[PDB]
Write a protein that binds this ligand. Sequence first.
Ligand SMILES: CCc1nc(Nc2ccc(CC(N)=O)cc2)nc(-c2cccc(Cl)c2)n1
Ligand SMILES: [Mg+2]
Ligand SMILES: [Mg+2]
Ligand SMILES: [Zn+2]
Length: 334
Amino acid sequence: QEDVLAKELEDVNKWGLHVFRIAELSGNRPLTVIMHTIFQERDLLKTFKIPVDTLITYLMTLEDHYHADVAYHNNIHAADVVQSTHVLLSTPALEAVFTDLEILAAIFASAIHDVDHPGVSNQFLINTNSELALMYNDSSVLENHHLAVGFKLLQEENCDIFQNLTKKQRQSLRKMVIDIVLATDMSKHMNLLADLKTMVETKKVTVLLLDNYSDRIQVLQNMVHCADLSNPTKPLQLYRQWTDRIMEEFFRQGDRERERGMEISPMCDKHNASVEKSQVGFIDYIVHPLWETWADLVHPDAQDILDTLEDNREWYQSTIPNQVSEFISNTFLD
Ligand SMILES: CCc1nc(Nc2ccc(CC(N)=O)cc2)nc(-c2cccc(Cl)c2)n1
Ligand SMILES: [Mg+2]
Ligand SMILES: [Mg+2]
Ligand SMILES: [Zn+2]
């Protein structure tokens, strides 16, 4: 089994890693083994003097605080966004652009970005007056929680993977990670995309040239957001599993809504679902516009990702036997 797991991990730098197989082979530890592999490959243990046992202990605890019973927002998703961010960081157009600390920030933000997700949306938590929505005053409720948990876990026994960073490095990493994870709040999508467009319009090359924090952090925010919305750009066997998982999670939120006598949210009604038309809409109004802009920023590095996305759209279009539009307006606008 150890030999087979290592053969799968050989694809860690490739778009389309068999992350589900890795989850099976690791005894459901895809986040831990993927993060460890990535930390080794990028020499981040040596650079930031992170003891290996400390890394593993944090990683295992982080992974335990992802909910295994939640169908999509679980440790397998987290592992995937980590690995996708890892690949995007190595695109040719960004060679030598980011420091090691910025790289660590992006990867760490990706690892914690959904930790302790309950499998229901921000709008559900707000509308049911949940404890979390009360704690966070209705704004980026989940994302503020993921951050709080991700950092609090560093305080458990032998979990402080940032113990040998300088005070300035810790502060700077924490500021970046907060900015990145808050930008994963889906309601920020349109503003993020607008800002990414504007940056592409004024971009300078030599490989991209990024002069200031503001431009660098924008690119990292968008990167991780692209990684979070990367499933439809993956090989179709992977995409299809991610779609089945997200619909299961949504339909479960619908069932909770139904039991409380609430109006069933768009995309959450298992009795009135249009899975394939809804993916086509998601790709057309959200994922293709974002990834086309990312592809411009890194031109021509992301051409194959775009082509896969377009092929994957045709497949869902071809398997069709209020809701999309209401879901989009409520989810991706401020
Ligand atoms: C198969 C990949 C996938 N991922 C995401 N990601 C996503 C969208 C919204 C949220 C917020 C939430 N409701 O939890 C979270 C993730 N959304 C979808 C989706 C599904 C149906 C319809 C739409 Cl517009 C989007 N599909
Ligand atoms: Mg999230
Ligand atoms: Mg409580
Ligand atoms: Zn996510």
